[PDB]
Amino acid sequence: NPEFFLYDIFLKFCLKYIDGEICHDLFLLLGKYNILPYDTSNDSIYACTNIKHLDFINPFGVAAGFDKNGVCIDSILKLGFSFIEIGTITPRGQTGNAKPRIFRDVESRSIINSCGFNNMGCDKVTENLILFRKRQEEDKLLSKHIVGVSIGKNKDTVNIVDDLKYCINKIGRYADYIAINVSSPNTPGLRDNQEAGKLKNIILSVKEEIDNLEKNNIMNDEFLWFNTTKKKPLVFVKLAPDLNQEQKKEIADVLLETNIDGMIISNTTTQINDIKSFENKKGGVSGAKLKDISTKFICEMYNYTNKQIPIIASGGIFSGLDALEKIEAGASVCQLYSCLVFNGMKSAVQIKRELNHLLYQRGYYNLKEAIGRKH
Ligand SMILES: Cc1cc2nc3c(=O)[nH]c(=O)nc-3n(C[C@H](O)[C@H](O)[C@H](O)COP(=O)(O)O)c2cc1C
Numbered sequence: 258n259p260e261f262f263l264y265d266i267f268l269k270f271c272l273k274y275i276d277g278e279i280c281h282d283l284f285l286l287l288g289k290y291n292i293l294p295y296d297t298s299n300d301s302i303y304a305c306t307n308i309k310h311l312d313f314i315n316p317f318g319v320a321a322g323f324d325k326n327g328v329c330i331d332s333i334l335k336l337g338f339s340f341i342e343i344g345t346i347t348p349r350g351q352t353g354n355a356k357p358r359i360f361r362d363v364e365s366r367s368i369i370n371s372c373g374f375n376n377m378g379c380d381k382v383t384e385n386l387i388l389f390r391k392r393q394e395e396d397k398l399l400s401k402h403i404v405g406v407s408i409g410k411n412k413d414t415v416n417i418v419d420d421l422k423y424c425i426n427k428i429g430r431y432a433d434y435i436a437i438n439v440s441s442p443n444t445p446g447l448r449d450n451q452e453a454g455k456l457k458n459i460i461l462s463v464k465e466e467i468d469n470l471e472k473n474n475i476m477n478d479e480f481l482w483f484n485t486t487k488k489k490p491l492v493f494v495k496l497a498p499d500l501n502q503e504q505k506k507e508i509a510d511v512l513l514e515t516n517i518d519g520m521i522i523s524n525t526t527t528q529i530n531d532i533k534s535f536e537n538k539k540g541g542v543s544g545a546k547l548k549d550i551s552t553k554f555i556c557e558m559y560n561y562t563n564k565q566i567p568i569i570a571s572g573g574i575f576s577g578l579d580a581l582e583k584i585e586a587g588a589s590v591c592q593l594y595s596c597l598v599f600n601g602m603k604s605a606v607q608i609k610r611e612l613n614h615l616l617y618q619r620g621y622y623n624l625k626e627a628i629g630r631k632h
């Protein structure tokens with residue numbers, strides 16, 4: 258497309274000269290005024306996938322932390338993605354850590370960030386999602402796109418459960434699934450909630466609050482769940498890769514005891530010490546160097562959960578083959594972040610063709626029969 262052409266020239270200018278967070282907020286602004294390209298094509302019926310009743314028109318979505326406040330959900334989705342995870346959000350708005358907090362190394366296609374959950378807060382983001390849901394009713398191109406909401410806690414909050422429950426009562430009606438963020442490295446002590454006993458109490462409290470949404474309601478299903486599924490939101494949990502194997506196995510059992518709807522693998526890592534551009538900086542590392550660690554973590558959890566917990570893959574997915582390794586290792590869907598940063602408007606259209614081609618040469622009849630094949 259001609260529209261894809263000029264955006265790649267702008268993109269190459271931005272990654273060379275412009276501050277990373279400025280670039281990001283510029284992307285978001287172009288999305289806010291709806292001047293990004295559209296992918297209007299029908300997605301291959303053979304690359305469609307699902308997690309329980311969530312029907313993804315294609316296997317690629319945008320990961321959390323891209324549209325933290327839900328200011329341009331439509332525009333990002335219309336680039337060719339099947340779903341987006343907005344957030345992570347907190348009950349109260351907060352500025353996050355001191356800038357600059359985002360750095361890119363183009364050479365290794367890697368990002369490091371210490372944002373610290375900068376977001377406008379649950380109430381404002383809830384308004385934003387409601388406006389999207391009203392536009393979704395009236396827009397032909399949005400009718401099957403899924404929107405999940407990643408939720409966390411404010412910096413100074415001590416009871417994470419109090420924060421999670423607040424967000425659910427606010428925004429749960431408008432969400433297709435809820436992602437519990439216990440894996441951010443940039444909010445002190447958050448990843449300590451991954452410990453098995455703590456995680457279990459969190460999951461059950463979240464599920465309890467989602468069930469109580471529908472229990473003082475007087476209106477029909479259609480008018481309570483103002484989302485895409487027309488159902489209560491599923492519950493996923495997003496894990497960090499920096500865990501040991503007995504932590505992984507005890508988490509794995511909590512996810513089955515809780516009957517959690519899915520698992521997002523993985524968040525950023527702190528164990529990448531080999532990028533010179535980054536050797537003084539704070540935060541969690543995204544991108545290509547995170548790929549091999551994520552796929553490994555997927556295989557381990559698919560195994561330790563006896564493949565009863567669907568997986569959403571996150572970590573260094575840039576190519577159709579990258580996606581296929583996530584799928585063969587056990588994932589049903591794939592989330593993109595770094596790919597967008599470094600490849601631009603084209604990421605969805607391109608990666609969908611690559612995996613479409615790759616699924617045929619491998620001899621898979623459709624995507625779903627590739628899930629967990631490495632095992
Ligand atoms: C700037 C930035 C902000 C992020 N914010 C969030 C967030 O708010 N919540 C979350 O769960 N993950 C967040 N992430 C992690 C990504 O969603 C994703 O899991 C990670 O970047 C790995 O994907 P990738 O290698 O394809 O980039 C953020 C990542 C970056 C780089």
Ligand SMILES: Cc1c(Cc2ccc(C(F)(F)F)cc2F)c[nH]c1C(=O)NC1CC1
Nearest residue numbers: 267268271277280281283284359598601602
């Ligand atoms: C580079 C990038 C993009 C793509 C992008 C941005 C601007 C423009 C244009 F110049 F056209 F405005 C075109 C584009 F393709 C989204 N986000 C980021 C980013 O750096 N995010 C920070 C690292 C975490």
Ligand SMILES: O=C(O)c1cc(=O)[nH]c(=O)[nH]1
Nearest residue numbers: 372373374441443525541
């Ligand atoms: O907002 C952040 O700082 C953040 C959250 C998260 O979950 N992962 C990440 O890398 N950064």
